[PDB]
């Protein structure tokens, strides 16, 4: 039995195609080493992140706030012209968050990912739920390397990533 | 060697499993843990208020302020023990 | 089984009934976290101490010792205490009653053993309770009386702070 | 419960696309069908309750308020308030005890008496969230024993109905206000 993703390596032992996001992809071995159910809750909660940071990086410069209309469209400048009283609620609801990731990863035997949050019912229909299962898990790995392309072409650019676009700065 | 002494009642609390007993929390071992929840929030509140008066310090700070900024402090031992009594049946 | 006073609280654990004025009020829970005996005493203490000092300022308004008059001026109710730090009325009255209250911190650690019953200093010179059901009626009057001693001080303080008149010299007009 | 299976509990739907869920029960006064946005998994469903029927109280000690507030003052309320009224006045009463005007103290004895209200009820919340004897929104407070038997389940539904209906309210008579001034019945009429 062989790696799908890649064709000639043998098949990764600790990975199986129930996995939502499964493609055969471990060249590394990480699964052979570390916890399988520990490394896809992580990988989840990494892809969510960049989801929300890959729409938010983009966002602002359609449109902001009016309380911070004011506030520079690139993030790397808007990230340090948010107070400490902002960043510190915006920490303190992510803390809120967390304490029932904390709750269901270190005293629970949940899936991973499920953090008891759906409200629509979405993944009631088990073909559906198959394919949002595996799409979230694309999408968070898609918002992945899109964040951090954003994020070091921010660094090089020092503005947002259409500002940077329309512009065609797109040389150092 | 010789007997090691302690003060009088003073019991095993050594504890292996998901929480303590409630025994470590002294007196506070019968407060319901919603209580000590919302003492922790009202705790984390008046502390920072009280706090954030006192930033800007003069040499004639509020006495009032200065006794309730303590409890910015106390909130985190109330709401591990919030945490405690929650898991404790509590 | 739910709380007397308030319906829609279960009754406090700690809270028996044997106690004059116990109709099961303790919404906090305060009554878990010290011992019963200790909180009777302090709420004894602040209660006579309260029925001293709402009684003093009512007959401070109704009347002055000999020769105060001059020495406070018209500075009545808590505008003598620094008055009379001034004057030595203060400290001598401060170490009198420290002396009292180490004497009562000896009761209180003996209350702490269960060899005293919350209050009981046997100081009954004239005989009143002469019977056990009298006994049991003047327990009752006496916390619900230093109760609201207590909440009478608070208004009697709080309202001469705003005013500067006292509790009597308001309700004069 | 009050026509049970007719005006609420089982087998009523209100949306016919978004089924309300199958952890929502069948036997709370006021349930209907109608949770189409699934929002009674992201809570405590005492905690719900009891939020929704505060507020649903509130609103109504507000609606009533609003309208004899914009119709009958009391009397001397006119030196201190005068032709102002609704959003503004609470802002003013603060700038009032900002002032120093040692008289208008209304709202920060409210906000003191309300407080402590809260604070001593508190932990009938904490053991309503543990499934204890008392109910979401019952504080025992029935002085005039008008519900003691089965006429209180008829209330019950008509209570929880105006709250909802108290909370329409407020935003109209709040909004009307915050584009124009004035108050319910001048906005009416
Ligand atoms: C930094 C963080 C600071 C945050 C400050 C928050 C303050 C809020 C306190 C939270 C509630 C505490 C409840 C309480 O106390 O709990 C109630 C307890 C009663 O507990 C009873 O205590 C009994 C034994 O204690 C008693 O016996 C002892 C021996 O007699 C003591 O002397 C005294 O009588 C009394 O403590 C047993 O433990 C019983 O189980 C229990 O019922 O009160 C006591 O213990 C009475 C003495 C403790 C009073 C607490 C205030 C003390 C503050 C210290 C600073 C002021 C110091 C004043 C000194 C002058 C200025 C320098
Ligand atoms: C990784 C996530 C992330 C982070 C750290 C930030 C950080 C920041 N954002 Mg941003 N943003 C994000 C995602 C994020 N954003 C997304 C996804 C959007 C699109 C909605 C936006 C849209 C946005 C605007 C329009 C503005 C900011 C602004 C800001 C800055 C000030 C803080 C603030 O007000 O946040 C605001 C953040 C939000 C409103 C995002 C909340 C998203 C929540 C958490 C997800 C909700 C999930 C779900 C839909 C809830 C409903 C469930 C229900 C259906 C059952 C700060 C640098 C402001 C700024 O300074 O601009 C320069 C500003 O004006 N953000
Ligand atoms: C709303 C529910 C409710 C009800 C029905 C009661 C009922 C009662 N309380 Mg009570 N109480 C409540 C809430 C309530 N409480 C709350 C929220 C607190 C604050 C934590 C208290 C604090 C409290 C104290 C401190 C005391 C009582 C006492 C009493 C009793 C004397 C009745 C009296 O004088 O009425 C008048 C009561 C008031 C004006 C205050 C309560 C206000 C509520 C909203 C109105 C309820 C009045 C009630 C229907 C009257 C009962 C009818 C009849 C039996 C007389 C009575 C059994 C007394 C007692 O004997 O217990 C030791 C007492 O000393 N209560
Ligand atoms: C701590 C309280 C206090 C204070 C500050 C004073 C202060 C004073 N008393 Mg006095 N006194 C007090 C309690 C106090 N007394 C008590 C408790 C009694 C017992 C009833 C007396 C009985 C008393 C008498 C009998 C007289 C004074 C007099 C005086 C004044 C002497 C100057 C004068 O007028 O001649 C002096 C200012 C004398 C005086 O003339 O005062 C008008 C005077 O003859 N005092
Ligand atoms: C029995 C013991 C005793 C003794 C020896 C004293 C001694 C004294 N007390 Mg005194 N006191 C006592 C018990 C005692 N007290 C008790 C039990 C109480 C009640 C708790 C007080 C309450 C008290 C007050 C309120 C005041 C004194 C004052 C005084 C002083 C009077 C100063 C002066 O010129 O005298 C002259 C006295 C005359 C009668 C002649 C006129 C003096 C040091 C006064 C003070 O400090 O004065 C400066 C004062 O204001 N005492
Ligand atoms: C509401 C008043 C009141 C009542 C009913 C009681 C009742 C009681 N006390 Mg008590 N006590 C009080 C106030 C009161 N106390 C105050 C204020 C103090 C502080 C000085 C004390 C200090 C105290 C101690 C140290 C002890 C008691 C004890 C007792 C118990 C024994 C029976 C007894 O003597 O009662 C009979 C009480 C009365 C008949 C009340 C007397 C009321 C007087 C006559 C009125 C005075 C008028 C006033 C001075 C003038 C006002 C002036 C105006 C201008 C305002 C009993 C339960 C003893 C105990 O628990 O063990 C057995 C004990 O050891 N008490
Ligand atoms: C949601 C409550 C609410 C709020 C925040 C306001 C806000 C205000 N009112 Mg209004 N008011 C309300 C309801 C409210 N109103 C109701 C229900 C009435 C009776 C129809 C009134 C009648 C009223 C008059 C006549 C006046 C005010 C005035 C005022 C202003 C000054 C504050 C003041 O003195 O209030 C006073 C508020 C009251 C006297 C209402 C108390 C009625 C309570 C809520 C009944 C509750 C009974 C119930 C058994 C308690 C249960 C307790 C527990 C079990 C839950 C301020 C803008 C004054 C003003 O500025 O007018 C221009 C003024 O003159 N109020
Ligand atoms: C319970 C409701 C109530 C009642 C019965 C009264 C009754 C009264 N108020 Mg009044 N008042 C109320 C609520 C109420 N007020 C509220 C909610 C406020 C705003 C905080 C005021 C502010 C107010 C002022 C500023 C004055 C009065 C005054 C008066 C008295 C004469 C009326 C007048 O001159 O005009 C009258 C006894 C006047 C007064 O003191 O006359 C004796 C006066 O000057 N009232
Ligand atoms: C939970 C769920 C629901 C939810 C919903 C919520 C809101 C879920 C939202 C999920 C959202 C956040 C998905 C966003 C995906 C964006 C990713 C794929 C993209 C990054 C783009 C990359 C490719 C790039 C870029 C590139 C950069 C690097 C450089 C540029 O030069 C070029 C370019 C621009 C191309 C709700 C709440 C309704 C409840 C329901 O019961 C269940
Ligand atoms: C000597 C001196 C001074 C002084 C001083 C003094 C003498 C200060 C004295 C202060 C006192 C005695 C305050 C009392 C406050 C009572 C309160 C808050 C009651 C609350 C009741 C509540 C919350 C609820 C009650 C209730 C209600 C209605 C509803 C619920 C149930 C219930 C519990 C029954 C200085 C330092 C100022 C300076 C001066 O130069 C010298
Ligand atoms: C979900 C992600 C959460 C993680 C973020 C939460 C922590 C917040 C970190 C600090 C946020 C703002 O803190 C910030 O304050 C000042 C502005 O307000 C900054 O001050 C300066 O910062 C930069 C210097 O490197 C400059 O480009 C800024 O123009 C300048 O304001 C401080 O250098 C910084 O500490």
Redesign the interface.
């Known amino acids: 039995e062989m790696s799908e993703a890649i064709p000639f390596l043998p098949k990764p032992a600790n990975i199986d195609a129930s996995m939502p996001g499964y493609s055969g992809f471990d060249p590394l071995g990480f699964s052979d080493y570390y916890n399988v159910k520990w490394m896809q809750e992580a990988e989840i909660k990494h892809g969510r992140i960049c989801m929300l940071a890959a729409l938010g990086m983009m966002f602002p410069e359609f449109g902001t706030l009016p309380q911070f209309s004011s506030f520079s469209t690139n993030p790397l400048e808007a990230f340090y012209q948010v107070g400490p009283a902002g960043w510190g609620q915006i920490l303190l609801f992510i803390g809120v968050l967390e304490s029932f990731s904390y709750e269901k990863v270190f005293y629970g035997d949940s899936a991973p990912g499920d953090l008891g949050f759906d409200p629509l019912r979405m993944s009631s229909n088990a073909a559906s739920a198959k394919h949002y299962a595996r799409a979230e898990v694309m999408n968070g790995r898609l918002a992945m390397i899109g964040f951090s392309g954003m994020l070091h072409h921010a660094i090089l650019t020092k503005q947002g990533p259409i500002t940077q676009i329309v512009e065609q700065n797109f040389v150092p | 060697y010789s007997p090691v002494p302690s003060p009088e009642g003073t019991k095993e609390v050594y504890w292996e499993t998901?929480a303590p007993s409630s025994d470590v929390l002294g007196?506070?071992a019968?407060?319901?843990s919603?209580?000590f929840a919302?003492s922790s929030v009202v705790a984390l509140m008046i502390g920072g208020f009280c706090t954030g008066q006192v930033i800007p310090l003069t040499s004639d700070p509020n006495p009032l302020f200065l006794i309730g900024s303590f409890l910015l402090p106390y909130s985190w031992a109330l709401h591990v023990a919030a945490w405690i009594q929650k898991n404790n049946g509590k | 089984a739910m709380s007397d006073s308030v319906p829609f609280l279960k009754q406090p654990e700690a809270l028996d009934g044997s106690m004059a004025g116990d109709v099961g009020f303790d919404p906090l829970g305060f009554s878990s976290i010290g011992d019963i005996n200790f909180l009777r005493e302090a709420e004894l203490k602040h209660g006579r101490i309260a029925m001293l000092a709402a009684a003093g300022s009512i007959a401070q308004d109704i009347f002055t010792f000999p020769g105060v008059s001059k020495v406070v001026g018209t500075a009545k109710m808590t505008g003598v205490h620094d008055i009379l730090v001034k004057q030595g009325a203060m400290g001598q009255l401060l170490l009198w009653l420290s002396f009292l209250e180490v004497f009562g911190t000896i009761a209180l650690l003996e209350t702490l053993d269960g060899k005293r019953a919350p209050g009981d200093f046997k100081f009954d010179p004239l005989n009143f309770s002469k019977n056990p059901e009298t006994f049991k009626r003047y327990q009752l009057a006496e916390i619900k009386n230093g109760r609201l001693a207590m909440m009478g001080v608070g208004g009697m303080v709080h309202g001469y702070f705003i005013t500067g008149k006292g509790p009597l010299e308001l309700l004069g007009n | 419960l009050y026509k049970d299976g007719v005006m609420q509990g089982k087998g009523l739907v209100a949306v016919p696309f978004a089924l309300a869920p199958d952890s929502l029960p069948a036997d709370i006064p006021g349930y209907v069908g109608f949770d189409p946005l699934g929002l009674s998994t992201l809570c405590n469903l005492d905690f719900l309750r009891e939020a929704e029927i505060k507020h649903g109280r509130v609103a109504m000690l507000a609606v009533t308020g609003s309208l004899v507030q914009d119709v009958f003052q009391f009397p001397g309320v006119d030196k201190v308030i005068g032709n102002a009224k609704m959003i503004g006045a609470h802002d003013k009463f603060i700038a009032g005890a900002h002032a120093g005007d040692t008289r208008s103290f209304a709202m920060h004895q409210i906000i003191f008496w309300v407080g402590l209200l809260e604070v001593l009820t508190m932990p009938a919340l904490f053991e309503t969230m543990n499934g204890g004897p008392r109910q979401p929104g019952d504080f025992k407070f029935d002085p005039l024993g008008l519900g003691k038997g089965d006429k209180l389940a008829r209330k019950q539904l008509t209570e929880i109905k105006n709250g909802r209906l108290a909370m329409i309210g407020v935003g109209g008579m709040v909004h009307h206000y915050l584009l124009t001034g004035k108050g319910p019945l001048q906005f009416l009429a």
């Open positions: 998901k007196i506070g019968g407060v319901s919603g209580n919302a």
